[PDB]
Amino acid sequence: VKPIFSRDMNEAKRRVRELYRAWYREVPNTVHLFQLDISVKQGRDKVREMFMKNAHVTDPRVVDLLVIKGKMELEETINVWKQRTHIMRFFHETEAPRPTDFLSKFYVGHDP
Amino acid sequence: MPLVYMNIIMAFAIALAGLLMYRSHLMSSLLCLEGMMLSLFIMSTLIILNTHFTLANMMPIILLVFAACEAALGLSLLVMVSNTYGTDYVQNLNLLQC
Amino acid sequence: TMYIAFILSTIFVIGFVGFSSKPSPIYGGLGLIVSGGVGCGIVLNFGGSFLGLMVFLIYLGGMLVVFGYTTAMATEMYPEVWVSNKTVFGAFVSGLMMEFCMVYYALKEEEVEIIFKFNGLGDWVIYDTGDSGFFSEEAMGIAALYSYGTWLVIVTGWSLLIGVVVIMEITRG
Amino acid sequence: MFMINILSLIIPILLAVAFLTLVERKVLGYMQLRKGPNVVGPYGLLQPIADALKLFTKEPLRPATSSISMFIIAPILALSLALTMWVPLPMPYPLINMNLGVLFMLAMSSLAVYSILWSGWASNSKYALIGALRAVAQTISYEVTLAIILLSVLLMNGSYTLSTLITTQEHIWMIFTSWPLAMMWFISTLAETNRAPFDLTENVEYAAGPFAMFFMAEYANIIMMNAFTAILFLGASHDPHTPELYTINFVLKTLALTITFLWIRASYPRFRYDQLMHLLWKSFLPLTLALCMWHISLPIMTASIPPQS
Amino acid sequence: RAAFPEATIIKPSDIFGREDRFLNYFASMRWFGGVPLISLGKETVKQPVYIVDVSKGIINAIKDPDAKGKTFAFVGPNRYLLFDLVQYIFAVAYRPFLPYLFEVSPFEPWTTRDKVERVHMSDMTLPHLPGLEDLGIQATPLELKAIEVLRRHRTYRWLTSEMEDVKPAKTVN
Amino acid sequence: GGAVMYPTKETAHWKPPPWNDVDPPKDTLVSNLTLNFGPQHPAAHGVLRLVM
Amino acid sequence: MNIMLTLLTNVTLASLLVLIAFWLPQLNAYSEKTSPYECGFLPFSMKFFLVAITFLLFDLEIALLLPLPWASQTNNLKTMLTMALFLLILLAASLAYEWTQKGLEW
Amino acid sequence: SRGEYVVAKLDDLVNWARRSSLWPMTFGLACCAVEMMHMAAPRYDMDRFGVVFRASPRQSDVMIVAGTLTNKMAPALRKVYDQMPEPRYVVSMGSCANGGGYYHYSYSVVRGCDRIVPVDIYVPGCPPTAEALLYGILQLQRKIKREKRLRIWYRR
Amino acid sequence: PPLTLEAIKDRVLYVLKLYDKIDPEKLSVNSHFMKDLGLDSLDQVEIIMAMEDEFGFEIPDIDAEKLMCPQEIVDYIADKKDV
Amino acid sequence: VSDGSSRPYRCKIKAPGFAHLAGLDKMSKGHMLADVVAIIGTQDIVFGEVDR
């Protein structure tokens, strides 16, 4: 199969690290640009969290596309194409926390 | 001399003092320079009128024209300097020394 | 209203202190517009109608408007008033105090002498009793520029044209 | 009694501006096959009052002015200068008779330009400054041509006295003598007041009252400039015993000129900054210079030099 | 309590938020000259509570089956010296800290005598009443939400450009 | 060779003038503006964003 | 005194209206728009300044051309006419220089 | 009482001014904007009623949401709405603006502009006829006429 | 005051101290980040970026991967500054 | 695209405005801001069809 950008997982990890550096350095500016109420640590924590969410991937092709999507979000963030709400959408705030305990779910509703 | 002449001459002195004592912006210095030209216009006008120097009533106008020419020059130099440096700060003019 | 000219001259000095304190350009430009308007008033009080309107139309109308034009396009300054940071506030206050000391030494003491001799008498005295008839001395003399001052016209015109040339050559980069 | 005259010059002009708003609305509508304000009062006569009351009750929003001081002075300057420009105008007898009234008018228009610069600079808005500077550029070019045309036409008046224009145009209107200058003068007046096609659509930060006063000052300037055009070119008969005749004729002429201002507004597409300046620098200015040469040479070559006094 | 025996009475302490009358009130001392502070507000320690924390507690109290009949007292996360609190308020609001009748106003009074007394009255401390933690809501420090309420009160260049970060004010705890 | 014949401690660090009278371009900050055609603008018809 | 009175009355009237438009209308309570001026950060093009300096110089030449109406009363009509035409020709020459060379870019 | 009489009459005067000189902003998003133009067209001529289309939202009093408010456009609508000065009224024109209409179950359509901004008058139709939109504006004028802001302040 | 190897080490260790995740007790000149300090790959990337900030240069990803010990970072900076 | 049912499987809509607006940048090169407004008009761009 034709690789999207990276032939091997090591090459893909190189792209992932490059994207992580750009996001890590952009977070301070992003807080300034959109006048966000999150701290620079909070934004960088979210960046790491988002990267760690897709940490189970093993296919270099999928990792490549994930990096491409990550780049696209960074491009919009850097170019101020996103708005303040768009950046805050990463930080789910209004959404009420849904519990994980079975007994709590049992009380909450018929949630499977 | 009448007190009005004293006041105008004092205005010239004050503007000269402000021009010689720069602060930051070269624009402020140019403003002081042009103020001095205004004060000289007023002084010469009053003198010519009181003396009834009819043939010399054209002197203030010529002074005014040349004053604004030298100003057009100052502004042109200021924008060249600002475009090069980014601001019109007098401190930027430091490449030439001694 | 016998000392109106003296009041105007004092306000002229005050405005000169205001813009000579080198404040924020926008505030200074005003310090100059105000002083310029006062000076025009003084010239009108002496009878120079044409010259009074000259400064209003050219100096205040054009020269200071192009000055403001530049300050507006190249705006790299933090706005501050004459009574702002001590660098400007102290200078403004001290200039006003010096002017007031001169005024007091001028009115209370008739023969005030700092560098020139000044007389505390109202400036109305210096006015001359005379009739011009159907004449505007200022206007007639200034119009004589085209008749008597041909040389002045030539030199001033050449200076203007070469000024346009010089401005372009300087602001061509 | 003199204060009564000042009030009788200021208040009627403001009321005239208020009703001029309605007149413009209706005229534009009927030129667009529409009925202007017709519900608010009979024939919309109460529309300006409704607009004023609504404006002076709307929540004023603050535009983060870098210098409230300056942001507030700009409206004052505009309105005061607009009111002052009406003073020297001879409706047969002027309120303040100046030997150099014309130059006074020109100087007052020149100061008015500052209101634009002050408004944009103090607004703390990049778009505001850009637009303000564009207005500066537009008014810059008009002033040159306006001054040249005014000088050239006054070369047959004999002085800068506004009252003398009535005597000069006693037999023939000045326009019949200087119609090209009249054309350029009218277009220059359009450019001065930024009336279309010299608008730059898309001092907006002004809210309600401030905006309302700026609007009033601009429209008063429109009416005053049309009056100046009337006195300069469309001379009116004045009977010294009965001045009301001249007053009526002059008012009618000014109204006609303002109606032409609206008529042009809804007749032509708006210019472009480059096009406006390539008019007021490369079409009007050379022609104004040539016509100034002609209007200097003509009185001498025709032995028609007007009396100095 | 007499009419409604099982009423769940809540006693918040100086709720702060975007449309609050406590943080914004201090940041509005500009109208009242400098910073009018009785005895420089040196003997007053206040415990401010976040608006969302109070609201969430109210909702939690409704759901809570044992909250009925219990008088809750919503306390803030930290107790701040009134002087330090106002200093912090003006600090993040980019306002010069100048440490230094309105009842008459028929429209909404700018200041009330009782309000003045309540402002200079140090907040009580009742450890015998259930608090936010009893309802599960975790108190949010004023520091985190301070900018959201007071950045909008910025003067010229502190929400951008300089953007100096003011450290948390000392808490009297 | 050097800025001055007898240099001081402060002047020692100071660099002699460039060979050509051309001082290097400093910063070279771009002045290209990035305007946004806000939708409310009439021409945008309310539903158009033109990053320009 | 009359012209001074007119200036005073106009200025005071305008300032009073500014008072009743800046402070009177804002007395009415309209809640509070807790909306910050979100700012997060220069077109000094010669295209503008050039329009300004050239205007200054042309305005200066216009100033020299103002005394013309009274200058027509001189007995030395030929000399006055020549000088006036000279000033106008110089104005045209300045315009031509800018037009022929890289100017009038506005 | 006399105080009530004075306040009521003044309130009526204020109400008359606003309802007579309503200045709407054209937030034309979709098909409904075309009918809005036909309202300002000569046949109906909203200006005849004093309702002049104010391009500047900073000088507007009524926001006529005309079209389908998509998720991408939703933040802009609210941000423009809060930048409007008060008193500000929102008129929802069209089923798409009212509750999504044809695109209610779309993945990128707000289920009614009511969620984003509070609405005062809902104009039904797809597109609502220009008379219906004109009817809604007149209904808003009557709604303003009924408002008693001053009276409540006095009776507070 | 030319940069010294000791000064380079001092600044490197200072940056590591500023990094809250690193335990000061386990911090050492040769303490491997991923083994001795037990950090993640992203943590190593963060440390490399912090070093770039401290010494005002840029490390490519390849060299960043190479830098697995504080002493290794010190040596790389020594080569970078030619000290 | 019909699958033989009473509901279309896929309905792609070719909007003429979509391609025209894509070429706006090419047409707008070397023009002023006001020219962009004219270029939008000459392409007759309705965002209803462009965004489909």
Ligand code: SF4
């Ligand atoms: S309601 Fe109908 S006409 Fe209006 S926008 Fe929606 S689909 Fe189009």
